[PDB]
Design a binder for these strands. Sequence first.
RNA 1: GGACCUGGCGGUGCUUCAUAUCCCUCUAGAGGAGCCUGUUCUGUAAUCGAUAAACCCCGAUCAACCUCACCACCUCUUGCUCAGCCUAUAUACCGCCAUCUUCAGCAAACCCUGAUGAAGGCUACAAAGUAAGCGCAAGUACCCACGUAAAGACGUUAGGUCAAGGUGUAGCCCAUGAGGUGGCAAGAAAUGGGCUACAUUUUCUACCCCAGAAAACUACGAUAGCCCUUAUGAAACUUAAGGGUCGAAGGUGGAUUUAGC
Lengths: 327, 81, 132, 50, 49, 101, 567, 128, 16
Amino acid sequence: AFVIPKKNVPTSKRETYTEDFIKKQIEEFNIGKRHLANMMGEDPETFTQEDIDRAIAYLFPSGLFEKRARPVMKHPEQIFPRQRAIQWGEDGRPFHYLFYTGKQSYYSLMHDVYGMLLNLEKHQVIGSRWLIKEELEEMLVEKLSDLDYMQFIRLLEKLLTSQCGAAEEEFVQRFRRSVTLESKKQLIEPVQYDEQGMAFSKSEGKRKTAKAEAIVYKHGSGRIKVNGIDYQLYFPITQDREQLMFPFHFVDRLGKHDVTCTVSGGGRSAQAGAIRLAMAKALCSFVTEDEVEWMRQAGLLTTDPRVRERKKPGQEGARRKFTWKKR
Amino acid sequence: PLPVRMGYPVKKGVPMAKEGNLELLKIPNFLHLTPVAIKKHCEALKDFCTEWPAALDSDEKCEKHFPIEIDSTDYVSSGPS
Amino acid sequence: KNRAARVRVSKGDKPVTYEEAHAPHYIAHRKGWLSLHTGNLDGEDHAAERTVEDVFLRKFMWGTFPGCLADQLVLKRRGNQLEICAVVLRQLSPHKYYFLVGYSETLLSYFYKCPVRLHLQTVPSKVVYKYL
Amino acid sequence: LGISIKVHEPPRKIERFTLLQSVHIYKKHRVQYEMRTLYRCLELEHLTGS
Amino acid sequence: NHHTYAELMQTLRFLGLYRDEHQDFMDEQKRLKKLRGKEKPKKGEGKRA
Amino acid sequence: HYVDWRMWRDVKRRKMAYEYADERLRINSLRKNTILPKILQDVADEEIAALPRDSCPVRIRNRCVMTSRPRGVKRRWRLSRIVFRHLADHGQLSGIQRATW
Amino acid sequence: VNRDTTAVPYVFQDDPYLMPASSLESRSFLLAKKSGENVAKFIINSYPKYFQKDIAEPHIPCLMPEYFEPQIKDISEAALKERIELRKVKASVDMFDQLLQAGTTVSLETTNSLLDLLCYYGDQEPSTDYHGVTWRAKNNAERIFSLMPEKNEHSYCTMIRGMVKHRAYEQALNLYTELLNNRLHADVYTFNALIEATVCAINEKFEEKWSKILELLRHMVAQKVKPNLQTFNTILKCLRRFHVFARSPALQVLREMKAIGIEPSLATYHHIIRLFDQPGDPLKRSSFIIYDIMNELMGKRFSPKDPDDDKFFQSAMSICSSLRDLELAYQVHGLLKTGDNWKFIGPDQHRNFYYSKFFDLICLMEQIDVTLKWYEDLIPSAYFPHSQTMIHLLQALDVANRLEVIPKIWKDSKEYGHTFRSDLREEILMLMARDKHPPELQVAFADCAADIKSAYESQPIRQTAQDWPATSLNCIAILFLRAGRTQEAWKMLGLFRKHNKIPRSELLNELMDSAKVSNSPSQAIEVVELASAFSLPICEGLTQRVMSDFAINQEQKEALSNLTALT
Amino acid sequence: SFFTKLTADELWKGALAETGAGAKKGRGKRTKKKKRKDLNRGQIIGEGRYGFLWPGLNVPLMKNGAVQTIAQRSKEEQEKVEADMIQQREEWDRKKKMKVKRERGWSGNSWGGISLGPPDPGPCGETY
Amino acid sequence: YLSGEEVEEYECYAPD
RNA sequence: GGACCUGGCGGUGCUUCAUAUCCCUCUAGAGGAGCCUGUUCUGUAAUCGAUAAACCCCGAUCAACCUCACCACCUCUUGCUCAGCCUAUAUACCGCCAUCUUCAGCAAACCCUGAUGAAGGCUACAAAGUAAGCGCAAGUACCCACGUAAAGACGUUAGGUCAAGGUGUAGCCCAUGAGGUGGCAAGAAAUGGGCUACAUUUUCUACCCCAGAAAACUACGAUAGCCCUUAUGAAACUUAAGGGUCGAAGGUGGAUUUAGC
Ligand SMILES: [K+]
Ligand SMILES: [K+]
Ligand SMILES: [K+]
Ligand SMILES: [K+]
Ligand SMILES: [K+]
Ligand SMILES: [K+]
Ligand SMILES: [K+]
Ligand SMILES: [Mg+2]
Ligand SMILES: [Mg+2]
Ligand SMILES: [Mg+2]
Ligand SMILES: [Mg+2]
Ligand SMILES: [Mg+2]
Ligand SMILES: [Mg+2]
Ligand SMILES: [Mg+2]
Ligand SMILES: [Mg+2]
Ligand SMILES: [Mg+2]
Ligand SMILES: [Mg+2]
Ligand SMILES: [Mg+2]
Ligand SMILES: [Mg+2]
Ligand SMILES: [Mg+2]
Ligand SMILES: [Mg+2]
Ligand SMILES: [Mg+2]
Ligand SMILES: [Mg+2]
Ligand SMILES: [Mg+2]
Ligand SMILES: [Mg+2]
Ligand SMILES: [Mg+2]
Ligand SMILES: [Mg+2]
């Protein structure tokens, strides 16, 4: 007999956190929670997780861009990854009758859903979405294929199309996650009053490097002042004046409002674009809600995100490459 | 005495514990400047301070009595010099 | 392929520390700086001198505590104070660690003409972040 | 200490510069570095020299 | 002052307070080159005479 | 104990230039005006030209202080691009990071 | 900010591996760090050119190398003064001889400055980093003094002080006679030395010595010399020998100080404290001397005036323990805590003696609820305890009937370097196993006994045969039984035979009760077999108990018959 | 130059040349191979050529209950230390040279017939 | 391989 | 020699393909002119490296001296260094990178198939695969979740760098080392990249977009040549800036070819 060199070190393997470990980790978190409250001179009883996060950010200031890499004193439940419990006892018998499938939680759910579809036969959108695979993989605490996810959803949809009762509705709702839709409705600036009592609204606009702030008066004769100058003197280019016309013309209010705006930065076109957006946003305070939605759909209330692209090293421009030398 | 952790965690891992944690050693911590300490420190430093003249309530009143303003700048940097 | 400060994938048997496991693009994102001073701030002077001093202190401590350092040094400057924070192992007897602290603090204080302090944190073994 | 203090954050400064990536040739391949300088300004008013 | 740094650390190495791993490496390579017959000649007693 | 002989020549050039700076500054002032007689300026031309060649500051070269590389040096840190990056890429240069934007 | 009670002193490295775990390491860790400082300074001074670049602004004079060598190589007076400032005894003598042979004039001020150097060090070189009576009969000081052309008061004074410092008491008195024959006047500092020589020159009865001193003091008044604090401190320090005879004379010195206007320092009372604290019954006198000394010192901040000021608190506490007065001890400690009086405690040996006598008096005369507050405030923050204070602490827990703290004292004892103290482990086990306790406490005492057992098993004297005292083995076994860890107790019985230690009667009776519960006859015979080996009288009576109590198999009955045959 | 020196790991990685196109495809063969040697192995912290005795680092801190002072070994006493360390280095090399030979198989260069020992113990405390 | 392959506890507070 | 497997290759099949992408299509260019600059060749007593894609304003975010490593001449020999070498070897290497990558794969440890052959291991109404880890991804930077950066494994080209530094092996040690003085770096030419042009969507001036003149041998067009001045420097026919003089080729460029969503 002789010796072969050992292949690897047993420490070079993934670790696991037993339930006893988490139980002691929680006892440290509760004792440290009282220490941290004592450090900051706060009542330990009313010390919340939001206070812990604030105190840890002060005591251990970290500027790392990735928040996950910053100091964290969270409850062990959140910190440690959820661990599936033992699936058999001391005698070695698995607890679940589908253990030897390797996917007892997934196939137990398919068995429960398939059984419900049978009982129905014997008896006989906008605000909700289906949970994603990464959320199903957490409800089950199991790893799932892409097709496994599809098969489960195809089976739930087949359950909605049937005459599902109340018991068959609480079940499907467990796997439906509410989808929040942001409202595209434009926010209307408040209507203010000046010393003389003239109603006006104020807003701001940005185009490239130009920034504009416009004051639109409820009543007027069509005068537009840009940095104290008549708009046609400030904007001698006919296209820059057309941009100022666009918001008012689109809602049929030429010659009905007075505007005093200030713009800085950028060029002549960027300044006209910034003023167009500033006037349009302020003008929304004096038109009907339907008119404000038509301006939105006309592109009059959206900040243009198109800004200059940086030059990269090793190329002539933002996109242009150096000549590929003749070979 | 805090179970503070720091470090980008590995897949299915946790931020590294404080023991032997270089990332926590790299931080300029403020453990010596807790709100309780700052307030006790400032209670001791009140004997070193003087009272601003009450007559000088506004900037315009200071200008009337003290028309000259002298600006100087001190620079605090790290190093031997 | 980029090489700079990248520990390369192997067979899964090489222990790397948190610092060694992060390439340069993660600096200021996942890992901080090993030295903190004011020389590299806008409008600040003496960056060249602070850099040479730091390169020396790292070599000085490596050879003064041979086989004892368990991670890179953290160098802190406040005013004229120079603080050296080192994670060391628990192999050398404590008497030798006190000798080398007294010796190193005094020698470096006279070399750079500033109050120097050395702070040692001991670990039973090199802290392993992952096995590459 | 009873001192009137106001605070604001002046705009940050980012100094960027480019260096060659390789030790030799390969001009078109560079590594870019930056130094970020952030500011906070504490403004105290109406305080004596002591 | 490269003289100060080199001379200081060399002095500390002879005093036993600084371990120069690089120098130790060079000392081992120089030791094995003598045993291999590749020794530095005496000035004036080079291969050309 | 300097990196190489070329760094040593620059070290000597910087020491000699420091010693002759005042002398050279004064002689140059006589040559850099239209006030003094040409007869006096012509003599000053000979006087500054007779000083040692390595007293001339234009002969000083900013080499990398750790590798003696004569080009690719960043004046602020006095390091070659290669040495700077090695220190920067290991997070040992305070406040310096890779630039993405 | 106040002292952190969970931490060791600030000078130590705040790390669990580098923190001192004992009073020995507390002393040795600082000496190792100080050694490194000396090694660094030795190198800095040996190779100063490496440490001459001054980049600090403002300049730091205390971070530059020191130059101990003379830079003037000419032979002249101004070159001798340099070697005197550097304290070069040999070089200065050689430079003085050569200068004298050449015939050049050396000033008087300089000649005296050379005597001050020789007379202080005794013509010997001061200690450096690296290269009985001590008044050498052949000494440069006496020679230069004789050759001296003109001698002033200062010349004699420095000769008289140096002789007394080096224990040449008889020569210094002889020289004091010439000074008077030459119509010269000495200073207070010379008189201080002469008082010391008068007492130490010869051994005589107190009355003879007390008459000479009063003659020196009267002489000091004839010469218009005013006595200083050290004059009275030397008198009291020198009267220590006579003890009872000097008790009333010593108190006459103190009353004289107050009137004259010199203010007694901490050293003035330390010497009075030591003088009255003679072996005997201190209640007669020492009681009211220390009570009056503290009422005077109450609420006084002290400044350094005498070299022996750092010995009062160590001396004062020593009497409080002897008198067993805890109210007095708090006043002494209260005086140590006012202002900056804590700096007069003394070196590490004086700090540990003061705190040992102080804490040992707390455990004795203080309530246990307060004693455990001092135990946390002082240890390890102020000092590391000696093993005899851990015992004094256990004796205090016992008297208070608070034995649930014993497992804590053992945990702390290990952290202070007392893991392998025999007197301590025996004390802990005896108290734990002295009487039976509720099941909750008994289980805790058995977890500690196991840890103590491990200490006996893993001693560092393991190279030598393990010494398992008889009491320790009996106590450890009894604690396992009373806790229900019978399996561990039965295993230990082998160690009574291996080490040949007599089993205790109580242990044998409790083993039977554990057998009758398990109904194991073999184990019951194993007990009778053990007591039979030692020929204990209870065994013969125990054999009767085993017969009735347990069913005896024919093999077991014959086994008992075999022991009966031995009977 | 002091600043041009590297660590022992960097020097051995270069000198050994274990990574490279030679070692990728075994394009280079190694009848003579550079072998890594640990040069900090027999080195004692505090020991230098000058033979200084630093209290608390290489000699005991206290001797006869008193703190030792800085001392230096005599020229003769230091030669013995140097000679003793050289002998210890050949003794260490001689111990490594003394490696137990294994029996050959069907032929000197053949693997056939050579014993590999018992199979490794299985995960469930199984042994063979 | 046939030449040979020879690459070739208790803790205390305040130890001695 | 037989049979089979893998790889390579096929003026090899079929199907779907490439998004600034292989072709056409879209816009501005290169290829012609002058100049700037790199390389080649030639020349010189007079460096070196890169040199198909992946070299050619490349190492250099830079050479009048210095830098410098080159040539000629002279000088020094324990030498700035407990020496030194920009000497050989990038086919011994570390270090830092190019390339596919404008990729998505690599793979420890097991398990099963082929009779336990080299080899192979997928079917979702599923038929032997499970896989830590690395990469992609995610996340972070910049102005968003977009975009652009950054990142981009293993492996491919013994790809590039011994002249960044360090270093294995081999070589020099009165010389292949060190120092000084002066000097080289030109163009008969070919070629790559770039700049300015050839003009009327132009030229000049005012203005910074409601103008007046110019407009073919006194127009457009040199950032070139020649002369002068100034700036830097010890040193400038030489480097840069400005002025004067001069007013050339060029009249929108064949095959071919670059970049951009
Ligand atoms: K094929
Ligand atoms: K063209
Ligand atoms: K390579
Ligand atoms: K190299
Ligand atoms: K080489
Ligand atoms: K040469
Ligand atoms: K071109
Ligand atoms: Mg462009
Ligand atoms: Mg790249
Ligand atoms: Mg230059
Ligand atoms: Mg053979
Ligand atoms: Mg062309
Ligand atoms: Mg070339
Ligand atoms: Mg070539
Ligand atoms: Mg090549
Ligand atoms: Mg190629
Ligand atoms: Mg040249
Ligand atoms: Mg050469
Ligand atoms: Mg290669
Ligand atoms: Mg994105
Ligand atoms: Mg990129
Ligand atoms: Mg990515
Ligand atoms: Mg090659
Ligand atoms: Mg030359
Ligand atoms: Mg011209
Ligand atoms: Mg000039
Ligand atoms: Mg013209």
